[PDB]
């Protein structure tokens, strides 16, 4: 296993070429989220197009905070959502052709990786306990 | 592993293989104090604190003074009557090297701890 990560800069009064305001950023963010875009995708879209560095350093607060602050928050965290729907897609594929024991092994690993952050999220209680795999 | 312990392993074996400068991250403040007192006693040389936002990188430049640092796991309480027997079964000889304790009023080695007449729990050692 190796490293593949972004290295956010030492600057935090970013970025001094930013002509744009700090309210149109929040406007674009709520536009994209009520268009139905996950936090990662709204971040990358306004990173590329309406070029921000990151909204946590242009606005004073991260985008999950401003999504909750504008009443648009998710009901499950993004990672658990993506990993759940990956689990249901691999389950649908194995249900279609049940001989794929490699998909069985991968499904065991995917469900274990579900249970990891599931019990993490129960211990921190972002989504409430009694919760076990929808 | 710990954060003080691997930094001490780094500056131990790096001068065992005989270099002059080492790097150590994540550089907590107990590492700051721990090699603060050893450059006070003249076992390393000057050291820089590169400060990013993540954790910080301490760069120690050192000559061939030192031969062994080391931490003690776990960190348990010792008395004024105990620090002499800990310097006995922890250092090679008596008046040579030091033993570093987290005392209550500061962070010091054994001789300044018994000079200020305080104690605390044992932290690490260097000779």
């Amino acid at each position: 296993k190796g490293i593949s990560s972004s290295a956010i800069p030492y600057s935090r009064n970013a970025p001094a070429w930013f002509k744009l305001s700090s309210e149109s950023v929040i406007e674009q963010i709520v536009k994209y989220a009520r268009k139905g875009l996950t936090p990662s995708q709204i971040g990358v879209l306004l990173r590329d197009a309406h070029g921000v560095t990151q909204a946590r350093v242009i606005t004073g607060n991260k985008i999950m905070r401003i999504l909750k602050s504008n009443g648009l928050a998710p009901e499950i965290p993004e990672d658990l959502y993506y990993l759940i729907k990956k689990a249901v897609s691999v389950r649908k594929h194995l249900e279609r052709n049940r001989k794929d024991k490699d998909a069985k092994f991968r499904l065991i690993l995917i469900e274990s990786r579900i249970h990891r952050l599931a019990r993490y999220y129960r211990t921190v209680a972002v989504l409430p306990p009694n919760w076990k795999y929808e | 592993s710990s954060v003080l312990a691997d930094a001490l392993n780094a500056i131990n074996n790096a001068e065992k293989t005989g270099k002059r400068q080492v790097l150590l991250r994540p550089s907590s403040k107990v590492i700051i104090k721990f090699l603060q007192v050893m450059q006070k006693h003249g076992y390393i040389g000057e050291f820089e604190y590169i400060d990013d936002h993540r954790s910080g990188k301490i760069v120690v430049q050192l000559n061939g003074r030192l031969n062994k640092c080391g931490v003690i796991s776990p960190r348990f309480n010792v008395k004024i009557g105990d620090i002499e027997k800990w310097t006995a079964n922890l250092l090679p000889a008596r008046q040579f090297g030091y033993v570093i304790l987290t005392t209550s009023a500061g962070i010091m080695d054994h001789e300044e701890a018994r000079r200020k007449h305080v104690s605390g729990k044992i932290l690490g050692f260097v000779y």
């Binding site: - | 005989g18 002059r20 430049q61 000559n63 061939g64």
Partner: protein, 272 residues
């Protein structure tokens, strides 16, 4: 040299002058042997700073790559000094033109801890952090001779006695030792037939120096095998850097040639 360089005389208990550029400590310093008002220092900014005490001011600074351990001026040339820095070579600098370190004495394997000149002004001596001192001619740039012994270790301060005959090497294991400079000569008065013979075949070795077995005999020493391994793997990685540089120089348009003497300089205040 401390956290800031102070000038004081022995008649008053206060620093007569501060002298530093800015906030950086001064790792060593040395006065001159002639034009005694001028002096040099080396700070942990990897920097050489010359000071003149007539104007009572620092007067130029260069920054090199790695930290300069110790300066020593020239007794004869009086405006040439030698810096010993932590990349494994000493640098015979000028003073009046500080942009080209006009000689580089190269053959070490670790940090060069100090250096001084012979009092005759043409043969310098470096002692380094590897367990070996060595003596250089001024106008070559490679080792005339290597001294080492098993008991000396991490030799920190080597100086040259005031009659250019002995090399005092103070190590890190405690001991301070004497060496001869010309390691084959002896220190008694000689009858003139011996003086004529030793001087005769000295001149004779000098003129037949480039024959390819006189050269291998007069070049053969016995280094400790730590220094042998480090020198040969330094050679293979330097050949590798030279080869990859040759490939880039074959392709790329303008990778301009920099001299070996100009390589280590990373900067200089007062460009002219």
């Amino acid at each position: 040299g401390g956290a800031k360089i102070h000038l004081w005389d022995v008649n008053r208990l206060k620093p007569v002058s501060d002298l530093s550029w800015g906030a950086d400590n001064i790792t060593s310093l040395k006065f001159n042997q002639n034009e005694t008002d001028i002096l040099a220092s080396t700070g942990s900014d990897n920097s050489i700073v010359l000071y003149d005490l007539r104007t009572n001011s620092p007067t130029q600074k260069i920054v090199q790559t790695m930290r300069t351990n110790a300066i020593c001026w020239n007794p004869m040339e009086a405006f040439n000094f030698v810096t010993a820095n932590e990349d494994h070579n000493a640098y015979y600098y000028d003073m009046r033109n500080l942009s080209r370190s006009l000689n580089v004495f190269k053959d070490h394997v670790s940090a060069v801890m100090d250096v001084d000149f012979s009092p005759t002004g043409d043969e310098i001596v470096t002692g380094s952090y590897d367990k070996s001192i060595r003596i250089y001619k001024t106008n070559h740039g490679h080792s005339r001779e290597i001294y080492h012994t098993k008991r000396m270790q991490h030799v920190f301060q080597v100086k040259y006695s005031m009659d250019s005959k002995y090399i005092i090497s103070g190590s890190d294991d405690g001991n301070v030792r004497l060496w001869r400079s010309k390691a084959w000569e002896r220190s008694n008065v000689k009858t003139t037939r011996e003086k004529n013979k030793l001087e005769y075949d000295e001149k004779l070795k000098e003129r037949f120096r480039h024959m390819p077995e006189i050269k291998r005999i007069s070049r053969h020493r016995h280094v400790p095998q730590v220094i042998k391994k480090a020198q040969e793997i330094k050679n293979i990685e330097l050949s590798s850097i030279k080869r990859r540089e040759a490939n880039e120089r074959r392709t790329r348009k303008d990778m301009p040639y920099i001299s070996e003497r100009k390589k280590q300089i990373v900067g200089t205040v007062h460009k002219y």
